[PDB]
Scaffold this active site. Structure first.
Site, PDB file in Angstrom:
ATOM      1  CG  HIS A   1      -1.730   1.197   1.483  1.00  0.00           C
ATOM      2  ND1 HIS A   1      -3.106   1.248   1.395  1.00  0.00           N
ATOM      3  CD2 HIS A   1      -1.335   2.445   1.833  1.00  0.00           C
ATOM      4  CE1 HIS A   1      -3.520   2.471   1.692  1.00  0.00           C
ATOM      5  NE2 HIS A   1      -2.467   3.222   1.955  1.00  0.00           N
ATOM      6  CD  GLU A   2       1.902   2.787   3.918  1.00  0.00           C
ATOM      7  OE1 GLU A   2       1.703   3.903   3.381  1.00  0.00           O
ATOM      8  OE2 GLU A   2       1.120   2.273   4.754  1.00  0.00           O
TER       9      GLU A   2
ATOM     10  CG  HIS B   1       0.287   6.170  -0.924  1.00  0.00           C
ATOM     11  ND1 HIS B   1      -0.917   6.630  -1.414  1.00  0.00           N
ATOM     12  CD2 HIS B   1       0.018   5.676   0.311  1.00  0.00           C
ATOM     13  CE1 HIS B   1      -1.875   6.398  -0.525  1.00  0.00           C
ATOM     14  NE2 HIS B   1      -1.329   5.835   0.540  1.00  0.00           N
TER      15      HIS B   1
ATOM     16  CE1 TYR C   1      -3.631   9.747   0.600  1.00  0.00           C
ATOM     17  CE2 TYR C   1      -3.709  11.137   2.543  1.00  0.00           C
ATOM     18  CZ  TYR C   1      -3.731   9.886   1.970  1.00  0.00           C
ATOM     19  OH  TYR C   1      -3.821   8.786   2.790  1.00  0.00           O
TER      20      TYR C   1
ATOM     21  CD  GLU D   1      -5.170   5.859   1.698  1.00  0.00           C
ATOM     22  OE1 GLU D   1      -5.431   4.737   2.195  1.00  0.00           O
ATOM     23  OE2 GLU D   1      -4.028   6.323   1.661  1.00  0.00           O
TER      24      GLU D   1
ATOM     25  CG  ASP E   1      -9.269  10.243   6.527  1.00  0.00           C
ATOM     26  OD1 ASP E   1      -8.019  10.244   6.509  1.00  0.00           O
ATOM     27  OD2 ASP E   1      -9.945   9.351   5.975  1.00  0.00           O
TER      28      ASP E   1
ATOM     29  CG  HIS F   1      -7.268   6.656   5.261  1.00  0.00           C
ATOM     30  ND1 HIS F   1      -6.770   7.911   5.536  1.00  0.00           N
ATOM     31  CD2 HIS F   1      -6.207   5.902   4.886  1.00  0.00           C
ATOM     32  CE1 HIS F   1      -5.464   7.921   5.323  1.00  0.00           C
ATOM     33  NE2 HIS F   1      -5.099   6.712   4.934  1.00  0.00           N
TER      34      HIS F   1
HETATM   35  N1  LIG Z   1     -13.119   4.057   8.897  1.00  0.00           N
HETATM   36  C1  LIG Z   1     -14.114   4.236   9.965  1.00  0.00           C
HETATM   37  C2  LIG Z   1     -14.941   5.509   9.713  1.00  0.00           C
HETATM   38  C3  LIG Z   1     -15.936   5.719  10.827  1.00  0.00           C
HETATM   39  C4  LIG Z   1     -15.540   6.190  12.068  1.00  0.00           C
HETATM   40  C5  LIG Z   1     -16.456   6.291  13.096  1.00  0.00           C
HETATM   41  C6  LIG Z   1     -17.756   5.926  12.847  1.00  0.00           C
HETATM   42  N2  LIG Z   1     -18.175   5.482  11.657  1.00  0.00           N
HETATM   43  C7  LIG Z   1     -17.271   5.389  10.680  1.00  0.00           C
HETATM   44 ZN   LIG Z   2      -2.440   5.255   2.175  1.00  0.00          ZN
END
Ligand SMILES: NCCc1cccnc1
Ligand SMILES: [Zn+2]
Ligand SMILES: [Ca+2]
Ligand SMILES: [Ca+2]
Ligand SMILES: [Ca+2]
Ligand SMILES: [Ca+2]
Length: 316
Positions: free
Chosen positions: A142-143, A146, A157, A166, A226, A231
């Site tokens: 995976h790394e 990238h 990203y 991702e 995120d 992700h």
């Molecule tokens: N990858 C988990 C995303 C998430 C986090 C908290 C609640 N629901 C979904």
């Molecule tokens: Zn990644």
């Protein structure tokens, strides 16, 4: 460094013995000269300075507990190099045999691994959420994927392009895991995640919702966490890729599977010929359709299956 190519032996994070390509010059270094312009593994010594020191060992035997993350980072970088070369005719991440550098023992109790634009970096985990992350071949691949993305499509990203970024790493991480053929699956990180809990992982490609990630565009995350859910929304693309390979019916849409090898060919061609830094999910569908058309023909089952898989996850 300058020296002569040697073969050491050691044990990885999971306790398995493997041979590793080293270089002898006074010490035996984790420097594999058999692949491209080399694979080099470094000790970050629990600090965050990078890369740290090229890994040196007095006797070419790597059985100490402290050695295990380095053994696996080095070995699995080699497997990933072999996958890209043997399957896709790609020489390292830049296509020109760039040296592959990895550092292990990054920071203290660090529950992550990453490509930093120049090299791979692995924490040891805190022993509860993760054990040292280079123990997962899918994590390593995976790394390194990238890096491939950075040199090809260049997907930014954030938001949908970042979720594609991702997913590409999860797809090829999984295809490398199947290539090595040791306990392969469609989950991510199972070999290093939560030593106290069996049967879990960070993410599932076959059923992203198992770990709270969306499996349909209508369930995409629209917030700012995120980097806009890179992700999280990766689950939508991961599910499409799983369906292309393995088939299935998903939200009432049937997909005829075409197998892992053709999935890899289609997505490799999409990544390297059609995707751009700002591609969104709809543009990925078009890129995959065109790639399958190039490889198999416009009337092929492969093209038809790409379309059904994106239909199944709500991406037009
Ligand atoms: N990858 C988990 C995303 C998430 C986090 C908290 C609640 N629901 C979904
Ligand atoms: Zn990644
Ligand atoms: Ca030793
Ligand atoms: Ca596995
Ligand atoms: Ca896996
Ligand atoms: Ca676990």
């Amino acid at each position: 460094i300058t020296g002569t190519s040697t073969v050491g032996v050691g044990r990885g994070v999971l306790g398995d013995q493997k041979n590793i390509n080293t270089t002898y010059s006074t010490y035996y270094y984790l420097q594999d000269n058999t692949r491209g312009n080399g694979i080099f593994t470094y000790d970050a010594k629990y600090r965050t300075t990078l890369p740290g020191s090229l890994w040196a060992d007095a006797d070419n035997q790597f059985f100490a507990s402290y050695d295990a993350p380095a053994v696996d980072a080095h070995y699995y970088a080699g497997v990933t190099y072999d996958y890209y070369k043997n399957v896709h005719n790609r020489l390292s991440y830049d296509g020109n045999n760039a040296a592959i550098r990895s550092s292990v023992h990054y920071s203290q109790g660090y529950n992550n691994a990453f490509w930093n634009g120049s090299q791979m970096v692995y924490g040891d985990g805190d022993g509860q959420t993760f054990i040292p992350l280079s123990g997962g071949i899918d994590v390593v691949a995976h790394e390194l994927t990238h890096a491939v993305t950075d040199y090809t499509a260049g997907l930014i990203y954030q938001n949908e392009s970042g979720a594609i970024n991702e997913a590409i790493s999860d797809i090829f991480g999984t295809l490398v895991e199947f290539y090595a053929n040791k306990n392969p699956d469609w989950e991510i990180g199972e070999d290093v995640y939560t030593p106290g809990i069996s049967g879990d992982s960070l993410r599932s490609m076959s059923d992203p919702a198992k770990y709270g990630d969306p499996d349909h565009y209508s369930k995409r995350y629209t917030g700012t966490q995120d980097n806009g859910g890179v992700h999280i929304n990766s689950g939508i693309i991961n599910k499409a890729a799983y369906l292309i390979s393995q088939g299935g019916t998903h939200y009432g849409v049937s997909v005829v599977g075409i197998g892992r090898d053709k999935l890899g060919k289609i997505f490799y061609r999409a990544l390297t010929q059609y995707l751009t830094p700002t591609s969104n999910f709809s543009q990925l569908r078009a890129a995959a359709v065109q790639s399958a058309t190039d490889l198999y023909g416009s009337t092929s089952q492969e093209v038809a299956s790409v379309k059904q898989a994106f239909d199944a996850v709500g991406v037009k």
